[PDB]
Amino acid sequence: SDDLPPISDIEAMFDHLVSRIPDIVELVRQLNGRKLRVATMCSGTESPLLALNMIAKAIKAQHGLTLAFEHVFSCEIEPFKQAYIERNFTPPILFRDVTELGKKRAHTAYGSMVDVPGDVDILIAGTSCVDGRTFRGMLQWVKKHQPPIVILENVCNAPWDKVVEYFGQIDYDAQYTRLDTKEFYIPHTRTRVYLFATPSDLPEKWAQTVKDLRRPWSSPFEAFLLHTDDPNIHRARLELASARAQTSRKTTDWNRCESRHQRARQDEALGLLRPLTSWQEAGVCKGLDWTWNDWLLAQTERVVDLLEISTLRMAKDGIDSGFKACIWNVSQNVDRQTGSSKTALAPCLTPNMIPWVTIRGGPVTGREALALQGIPVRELLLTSENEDQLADLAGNAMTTTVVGSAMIAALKVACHKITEGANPEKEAALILEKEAVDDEQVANRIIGEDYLEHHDLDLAKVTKSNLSEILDLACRSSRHCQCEGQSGTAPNILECQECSYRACKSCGGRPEHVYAPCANQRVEPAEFEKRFKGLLPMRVRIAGLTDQCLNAVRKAAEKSNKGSVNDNDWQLWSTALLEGIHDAEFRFRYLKRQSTWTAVYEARRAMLSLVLRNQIPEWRLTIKAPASEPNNSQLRALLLHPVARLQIDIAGQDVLCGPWELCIPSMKTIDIEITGKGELLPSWQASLGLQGPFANTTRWSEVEISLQAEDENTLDRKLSGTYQLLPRCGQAMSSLHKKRPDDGLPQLYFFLDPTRCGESREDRYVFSTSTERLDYGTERPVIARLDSHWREGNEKQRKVKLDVSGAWVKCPEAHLTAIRATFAIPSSASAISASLTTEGCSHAMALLSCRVPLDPTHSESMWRAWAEIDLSHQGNTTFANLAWITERLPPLDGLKNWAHIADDVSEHVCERCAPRPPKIHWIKTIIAFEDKLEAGQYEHALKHRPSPFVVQLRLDQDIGSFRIGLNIVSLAHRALSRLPKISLSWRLTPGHVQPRRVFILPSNKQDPKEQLRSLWWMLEQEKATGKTHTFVEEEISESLLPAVGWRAEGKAERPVMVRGGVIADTVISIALVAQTLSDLKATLIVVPGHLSKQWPNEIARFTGSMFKVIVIQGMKDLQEKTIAELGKADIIVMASEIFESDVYWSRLEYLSAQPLHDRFFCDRLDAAMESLVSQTKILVLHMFRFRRVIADEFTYLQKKSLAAVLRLSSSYRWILSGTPPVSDFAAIRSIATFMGIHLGVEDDGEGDVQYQKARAKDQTQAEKFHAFREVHSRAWHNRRDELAQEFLNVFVRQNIAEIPTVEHIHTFKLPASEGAVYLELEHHLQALEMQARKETKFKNVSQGDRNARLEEALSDSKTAEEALLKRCCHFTLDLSDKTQDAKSAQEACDHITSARARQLLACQEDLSRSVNQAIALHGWIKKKGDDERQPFAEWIAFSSNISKHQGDIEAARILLKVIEKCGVKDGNIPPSPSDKQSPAKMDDVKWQLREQTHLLRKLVKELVARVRSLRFFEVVRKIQKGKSDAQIVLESSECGHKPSTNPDIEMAILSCCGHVACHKCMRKAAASQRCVKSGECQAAVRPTNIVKVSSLGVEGELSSGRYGAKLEHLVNLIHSIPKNERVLVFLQWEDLAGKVSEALSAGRIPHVTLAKSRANTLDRFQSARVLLLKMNSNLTTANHAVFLGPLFTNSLFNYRAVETQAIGRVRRYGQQKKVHIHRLLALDTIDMTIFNARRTELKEKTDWEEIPQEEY
DNA sequence: GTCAGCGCATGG
DNA sequence: CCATGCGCTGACA
Ligand SMILES: [Zn+2]
Ligand SMILES: [Zn+2]
Ligand SMILES: [Zn+2]
Ligand SMILES: [Zn+2]
Ligand SMILES: [Zn+2]
């Protein structure tokens, strides 16, 4: 309820629970100090563990008695759940599965197979223990050992009774009840079912006590949600925008549920428009400017529209969702929603949820979902878990307070059944020995501190530069658009003009102000944080208030006309104030930007914050209410708002220097009078369009407030004046007003202020000078609230009560004052290096020792001797309580460059800093395991690993001191263990807080024609003159401290020397190998087989009989060749298919004497590679090495021969390739792996999710577990990519054109009729829902014919944009068929009109036939046999009424005509005209009728779309005709602004409908989502739909003869260029190849079109001028590579490859003229869309060399 | 095989 | 009659 104290901390929940039950104090002694033994299963979140732990702490604080518990083991099945449990809640044993627990041994998560420990006190299973194979396993285990208590839980609707009879087998009692989490302290509504089962009326007693321990919720859910600014929420919001940029719009059909949405929007009598998201068919959705729009774009049309329906259903009441925090779970249907019965609650967050937090405008992130389960998220470790995975983990989790209640009542009622160890003396001796050895070890743990500078002392010092300048910097540093979030910047800010509010261009379109760009030269928020922290004092104290001074103030306010105080209120308020201020120090916590920086100071009972408003900033003081103070107490009411405000002296330089002010609880109510003036406007409900009583009501546009002279004198700031409202500016209920002009004082607004959790009536109109959006736990300045029963209205004037309370009274007596505090850093880098020694892995070495004095009075218990800070569980909350000293410390930039020993051991494993990962086997399919012994040793030496950072705190004799300890040796040893003369390093970086990097290649240019020069970098690199180390390897083993802002690496690098390289343009390699010779000596080359023939020809042509050639090909050439025939021959060839042939592996197995049968292959192969080389060292090409190796098509290899190419050995190693797969780090590592360098190690986080899942069919289960357990950070990945880039600059060379090129882009507007036909086809394919035909074959041909008829509109090809490209290239309704041929323009359009008419008719008869079949069904049911509803009859009743229709009323009339052709009048006739047979059970027949009804509805919608498209086409043709018949339709406009008026401005026609109206008067209708005559059509209009008449053109603007405009312009181009130059034309569509061949034939020039005679046609081309060919042996005589529009493909990469290949056909070589490349483009057309999108994407994502452009 | 449509059931 | 359940199955790749 609310009468309870408000409780929001889990530990306090448990303290208030244990207080209820005083019978665990008696439990501890039957236990007699023995450790409890708890063994849970299948709970992924360990709420048994957490609840029992907090019970231990609560009981210790309540009664001084200590409870223990030895968590015996736990079971979890999926990998990420196992990783989470073993990373947060470390158990002894974590088993993979649950069935094996019957056995004596079972596998563990690491694979060790350690036995099942057996007897336990208590078992808590849930969330998978009823499946039943798993339940059989759990019963088997509970039969094997005897637990005296078992507690289960699962989803409620399940067979719990069946569970009872099953537990009857093992002779166990049983009892089950359902438990409501909303009733155990938590504001979240959920129901689950528990049972208790014990060996042989006890479970009855258990049920009674658990029913007893009930305590309702009393804190709104919003106290559990993290803020919307928070860094974790903002990274979760940037994930969405990043994914959207990395990633067309496939439309799921949802008709059966759209039926329910329509029934709801009609039955609830709410309007049919969509306010929050304005989604659209084949159109994006633009939510408000604060609403996570990249999450609104991803979700489906059903979810989005269901948000729409929920928002309207709430706006009926008066609540305005978007200002009242509530949660909606929109996964379920639309009729079965009670999204939050009480708005302060939260619905059951089911595992497959889609939640929407009403306020922040986005989903409950996974972490907040975990919080509402009771788990604390302050210290939670989460390592790359997806959102869906987190929602599963949280939803199936079980609620800590509920488990605690059930489990403590269980453990009390079943007290007597647990036996006792009963040796408390030995228990005390053991635990005390443990504590003593722990303390000795922790005192020893840090070493060093002898080399430490100990130099500075500082605290409470400032800089006090200039407060005016600081305020100017704040105004430009603060947050601007909601998408910033405490960092980053968003360019193109827009600032409103009245009520200056800001948003970027991207966001911030939707509630339109009068925007205009802002002149705010941005400044980096980190820099302002530096100055602000350097100006604040870090500890302050309020001083100078006594009871007598407070009394003096109260009588001063009484002396003036400021409202007096009731004496009891004065007593409570003054006592709380004085006790809070009295000797309590303020310390700095955090400063946060929310469009105005707030600096927050917290003391132990009062809390005070600095706000840097752009005008009159101040400090405000609010006092925390007492801990146990009921929610409806007058004291808690009084201590809500701040009581003390300290304005700041602007001209002065110091920050804490102003006068104080106090507010006494006056509570004065005066009367105002609100009037009406101005015109009338549509109310908010009517702007949402609700058709209840809220339809066409109105709202006044100017109020005026008058107040008496005495009241205005009493008020601090005057309140009269006339407030116009600002309907386009958005606030509470779109009710923001602005005061007409005192000039210095800030502008104040009269609007509505709703409380975040109250009812719909407690929201009262306010006055304020502050209108921003604010968090939970912050309150706005308020001048005077108004009565809550006043809203905007149409009435004239009322006298409503204005209640101004708490007049601000100024006191002089108060004042705010500030306050060997030394900190130590290591002076010298490399002093550490000298100080450190090997085998000193044990002891960290100090980095900082600070000492700042404290007091022993009321100081924390996080101080103590020393103490483990236990950072992995409490460091995040520790280094928050040390801001007041850490914020002063200089960042210690001295140690920022690596330095350490060298010539370290070339191979080592510490096996305490980095134990050896186990070894992998195979079964035979392939299934891999882990060694029992090796895996057990791995688990042991992994659980016992050293601490990378140590932080400890000490307080001995009221002086505070803490030391920071870092291990160097441990990072170094991890660095070495990563690697396969190794000189180590280490460095530390202070203060560290993105698109995939492009990978460029260094050209072979400006080096000692190109055939000669590119050899220079070849030979000298082959020799490697000098070059002791050509490449220096690396590894980095780095751990970081989150809060303080440090990340310390450790680098182990192996220098290596290697020869070779990679070149990307066979003609120079062969020109090289002859010299290098001037197995023993033999050079190998591997070619796929397509291209092996060219090398013997080329070597014969270049070198004449210089040597021997041993070219081979295919399998049966190894057996002929012997050693002395193969040898002493300079050039050898090979074919990559041979390494794929099984003969090669047969021979290799035989010669290697291995028992192999083609990752698995790459394992067994290298076993044989070790074997062969020993037999060859005694006295298949991979049994022997070479001097050189050259590969030609590295990209082509298919991992099966690629393995062999890696394995083969040689003295030198080269590559030839057209281009390598250098775009990605995995491929870069593959190239380097061939070259022989361990460039990096694979950590399975760097590849995208596609490639990760490509590999993750290989990984062992334990390896998936480890990959989720241990993750490495973004900076690590970036460093490794930088390393790969340096590798590229070293070794890979690339040869590129320049033979100049110049590109001429010819652009033109399409002539009128041709543009008109393109327009119609595009908007038709938009009106219908098909972007592409579907390839699946439907179950029923009665659906097949229908879907074919729908697909008819795509007569050309598959995707819609493809048909659009064909329309651009040449106008014709259908290319494929030659039945009708477009002789000219204005005739193809006639073909369109006829075909559209035919299709529309065919639609009508399909509708009639379906109606007849349905009527036959209805007759069958009626003949063969109250309350229940039969949807077809209501469909008929709805249809036969013309007045209630959505969609064009013309289509509605046509529907009436079709029904009356079927003869039904008002809904009643048994037979159908031309009746068919209606196919045994009556229920199945009813269901058939139902499905038929849905089919009719779908057909109706399709009819509506068809008639609208037809309307649009006839109208646009009318306009383009240009006659008086044309201008008549202009004269008939639903606007009323006719053209035949003295002003003749502009007209425009929509596209969704067809109507036409005043353009200026069209924009309003568009921006409110209403068609110009919405009584006529229900259009779903958006501002992109408007089309101005001047864009279309008029008939006969641009002449067209018999051909498409693009074809004509191509003809003109070829005629224009000179006659000697030859042409090459690229097409994309073969249909278009035919049409353009026709066009060029109709021209004057000849042409040549290009299976095996294609090369002959190329020979012919060497004749005719132009050879046109499809886009996607070298001809270069032609030098004009004309294009026809842009390529489109499914990927930017592939677009780049095809376009550069198409160019490289003609730009290749042998040009004595400058190659032109053209692109014909049509303005405002999808060719422009595709081309510009591809250019803009391609420039950033690849940065290739931009082709120069000129006019021609 | 991954995933969003699509639907009455059930104690208290 | 309220208030709260929380997944199986038939498209699509
Ligand atoms: Zn505004
Ligand atoms: Zn923005
Ligand atoms: Zn070590
Ligand atoms: Zn319309
Ligand atoms: Zn108009």
Using the CB atom, is residue A303 less than 7 Å from strand B?
A: yes
Neighbouring residues of A1656: CB distance < 8 A, sequence distance ≥ 6: none
Cβ neighbours around A159 below 10 Å, total = 13
Burial A579-607 (b: 16+ CB within 10 A, else e): ebbeeebbbbbebbbbbbbbbbbbbebbb
Q: What is the dihedral of CA A1275, A1278, A1282, A1283, to 10 degrees?
A: 80
Distance A337 CA to C2 C1' (A): 14
Binding-site residues of A for ATP, please? Answer: 1065-1066
Q: State how far the Cα of A1403 lies from the Cα of A1392, in Å rounded to an integer.
A: 16
DSSP state of A1684: B
Is the CB of residue A824 less than 8 Å from the CB of residue A849?
yes
Domain with residue A106: its CATH number is 3.40.50.150
Query: Pick from A502, A480, A486, A8: which is nearest to A233 by CA?
Result: A486
Q: State how far the Cα of A1426 lies from the Cα of A305, in Å rounded to an integer.
A: 34
Domain with residue A1551: its CATH number is 3.30.40
Amino acid residing at A975: A
Amino acid residing at A526: A
Quickly tell me which residue has 């996964």 as its tokens. A331
Q: State how far the Cα of A648 lies from the Cα of A464, in Å rounded to an integer.
A: 13
C-alpha A729 to ligand 1 mean position (Å): 5
**Same structural domain, A1627 and A1710:** yes
Give the ranges where A34-98 is alpha helix by DSSP (H): 47-63, 79-88
Cα–Cα distances in angstroms (integers) from residue A1518 to residues A1327, A1384, A1556, in the given order: 21, 19, 12
- As given in the structure block, the two tokens for residue A593 are 């930007």
The bases of strand C with some atom under 7 A from any protein CB are: 3-7, 11-13
Amino acid residing at A383: T
**Same structural domain, A981 and A833:** yes
Cβ neighbours around A637 below 10 Å, total = 14
Q: State how far the Cα of A1099 lies from the Cα of A1106, in Å rounded to an integer.
A: 10
Distance A1257 CA to B1 C1' (A): 13
Using the CB atom, is residue A1654 less than 7 Å from strand B?
A: no
Domain with residue A1181: its CATH number is 3.40.50.10810
Using the CB atom, is residue A253 less than 7 Å from strand B?
A: yes
Cβ neighbours around A29 below 10 Å, total = 12
Is the CB of residue A131 less than 8 Å from the CB of residue A45?
no
Using the CB atom, is residue A956 less than 7 Å from strand B?
A: no
Q: State how far the Cα of A69 lies from the Cα of A38, in Å rounded to an integer.
A: 7
Quickly tell me which residue has 């509605």 as its tokens. A1452
Q: State how far the Cα of A818 lies from the Cα of A814, in Å rounded to an integer.
A: 14
Using the CB atom, is residue A1641 less than 7 Å from strand B?
A: no
Is the CB of residue A1313 less than 8 Å from the CB of residue A1600?
yes
Neighbouring residues of A1348: CB distance < 8 A, sequence distance ≥ 6: none
Angle of helix A1274-1291 versus helix A1225-1235 axis, rounded to 10: 50
CA–C1' nearest nucleotide, residue A156 = C5
3-state secondary structure of A920: strand
End of a domain among A387, A422, A457? Answer: A422
Amino acid residing at A859: S
**Same structural domain, A1546 and A1695:** no
Q: Which residue is nearest to nucleotide B3 (CA to C1')?
A: A352
Amino acid residing at A1736: T
- Residue A1536: nearest ligand to its CA? 5
Q: Residue A71: phi, psi to the nearest 5?
A: -65, 105
Q: Which residues pair with A1667 in a beta bridge?
A: A1624, A1648
Query: Pick from A890, A881, A871: which is nearest to A960 by CA?
Result: A881
3-state secondary structure of A1170: helix
Q: Which residues touch strand C (CB under 7 A)?
A: A 155-158, 180, 182, 189-192, 250, 252-253, 329, 331-332, 336, 338, 341, 347-348, 350-352, 1334-1336, 1339
Distance A257 CA to C13 C1' (A): 24
Query: Pick from A12, A1, A8, A13: which is nearest to A401 by CA?
Result: A13
Query: Pick from A1484, A1660, A1446, A1483: which is nearest to A1571 by CA?
Result: A1446
- Residue A290: nearest ligand to its CA? 2
Is the CB of residue A1509 less than 8 Å from the CB of residue A1324?
yes
Using the CB atom, is residue A50 less than 7 Å from strand B?
A: no
C-alpha A1566 to ligand 5 mean position (Å): 12
Q: State how far the Cα of A427 lies from the Cα of A931, in Å rounded to an integer.
A: 37
- As given in the structure block, the two tokens for residue A702 are 């100017």
What is the separation, in whole angstroms, between the first and last Cα of chain A? 80
Q: State how far the Cα of A1375 lies from the Cα of A1389, in Å rounded to an integer.
A: 14
Q: State how far the Cα of A1338 lies from the Cα of A1340, in Å rounded to an integer.
A: 6
Resolution (angstroms) equals 3.8
Q: State how far the Cα of A430 lies from the Cα of A424, in Å rounded to an integer.
A: 10
The answer to whether residue A1130 sits within a structural domain is yes
- Element housing A1449 (H / E): helix A1449-1461
Dihedral angle sign, alpha carbons of residues A129, A134, A139, A144? negative
Quickly tell me which residue has 């559990």 as its tokens. A224
Neighbouring residues of A44: CB distance < 8 A, sequence distance ≥ 6: A76, A78, A81, A84, A85, A127, A393, A396, A397
Using the CB atom, is residue A258 less than 7 Å from strand B?
A: yes
Q: State how far the Cα of A490 lies from the Cα of A978, in Å rounded to an integer.
A: 41
Neighbouring residues of A756: CB distance < 8 A, sequence distance ≥ 6: A220, A222, A324, A325, A359, A776
Domain with residue A1647: its CATH number is 3.40.50.300
- As given in the structure block, the two tokens for residue A981 are 């003369």
**Same structural domain, A1587 and A1633:** no
Q: State how far the Cα of A647 lies from the Cα of A659, in Å rounded to an integer.
A: 7
3-state secondary structure of A629: coil
**Same structural domain, A1538 and A1563:** yes
Query: Pick from A124, A156, A135: which is nearest to A50 by CA?
Result: A124
**Same structural domain, A1547 and A1618:** no
Q: Residue A354: phi, psi to the nearest 5?
A: -130, 85
Q: State how far the Cα of A963 lies from the Cα of A950, in Å rounded to an integer.
A: 8
Is the CB of residue A1588 less than 8 Å from the CB of residue A1559?
yes
Amino acid residing at A1175: Q
3-state secondary structure of A898: coil
- Residue A1541: nearest ligand to its CA? 5
Query: Pick from A1481, A1746, A1716: which is nearest to A1621 by CA?
Result: A1716
3-state secondary structure of A94: strand
Say if residue A802 is exposed, middle or buried (CB neighbours under 10 Å; 0-12, 13-18, 19+). Answer: buried
DSSP state of A1383: -
Query: Pick from A316, A321, A207, A305: which is nearest to A269 by CA?
Result: A316
Strands, E assignment, A1579-1663: 1587-1588, 1622-1627, 1647-1649
The answer to whether residue A580 sits within a structural domain is no
**Same structural domain, A1178 and A1122:** yes
The answer to whether residue A537 sits within a structural domain is no
Say if residue A440 is exposed, middle or buried (CB neighbours under 10 Å; 0-12, 13-18, 19+). Answer: exposed
Query: Pick from A188, A187, A181, A190: which is nearest to A214 by CA?
Result: A181
Q: Which residues pair with A786 in a beta bridge?
A: A802
Using the CB atom, is residue A162 less than 7 Å from strand B?
A: no
Cβ neighbours around A1108 below 10 Å, total = 12
Cβ neighbours around A910 below 10 Å, total = 19
The answer to whether residue A1254 sits within a structural domain is no
**Same structural domain, A1191 and A1072:** yes
Q: State how far the Cα of A1596 lies from the Cα of A1523, in Å rounded to an integer.
A: 12
Quickly tell me which residue has 């094997």 as its tokens. A144
**Same structural domain, A1690 and A1605:** yes
Tell me which residue range forms the domain holding A160: 10-222+399-422
Mode of pairing for the β-strands spanning A721-725 and A737-739: antiparallel
Quickly tell me which residue has 């090979």 as its tokens. A1134
Amino acid residing at A234: H
End of a domain among A1575, A1593, A1611? Answer: A1593
End of a domain among A1217, A1245, A1274? Answer: A1217
Q: Which residues pair with A346 in a beta bridge?
A: none
Q: State how far the Cα of A452 lies from the Cα of A457, in Å rounded to an integer.
A: 14
Q: State how far the Cα of A1177 lies from the Cα of A605, in Å rounded to an integer.
A: 82
Is the CB of residue A591 less than 8 Å from the CB of residue A486?
no
Distance A931 CA to B10 C1' (A): 51
Q: State how far the Cα of A895 lies from the Cα of A1636, in Å rounded to an integer.
A: 71
**Same structural domain, A688 and A753:** yes
Q: Report how many domains make up chain A.
A: 8
**Same structural domain, A983 and A878:** yes
CA–C1' nearest nucleotide, residue A354 = B4
CA within 13 Å, CB half, A401: 33
- As given in the structure block, the two tokens for residue A1690 are 């499914």
Q: State how far the Cα of A1097 lies from the Cα of A1105, in Å rounded to an integer.
A: 13
CA angle (A1206 as vertex; A1200, A1210 as ends), nearest 5: 140
Q: State how far the Cα of A151 lies from the Cα of A160, in Å rounded to an integer.
A: 12
Cβ neighbours around A1630 below 10 Å, total = 10
DSSP state of A410: H
C-alpha A1453 to ligand 4 mean position (Å): 16
3-state secondary structure of A515: strand
3-state secondary structure of A12: helix
The bases of strand B with some atom under 7 A from any protein CB are: 3-8, 10-12
CA within 13 Å, CB half, A1194: 26
Q: State how far the Cα of A504 lies from the Cα of A481, in Å rounded to an integer.
A: 6
**Same structural domain, A1604 and A1725:** yes
Is the CB of residue A1740 less than 8 Å from the CB of residue A1324?
no
CA–C1' nearest nucleotide, residue A337 = C4
Active site residue ranges of A: 129
Q: State how far the Cα of A1421 lies from the Cα of A1430, in Å rounded to an integer.
A: 11
Distance A318 CA to B12 C1' (A): 32
Cβ neighbours around A1207 below 10 Å, total = 15
Cα–Cα distances in angstroms (integers) from residue A790 to residues A80, A751, A787, in the given order: 54, 12, 6
- Residue A293: nearest ligand to its CA? 2
Q: Which residue is nearest to nucleotide B7 (CA to C1')?
A: A333
Cα–Cα distances in angstroms (integers) from residue A1067 to residues A341, A1101, A1136, A1629, in the given order: 79, 11, 20, 36
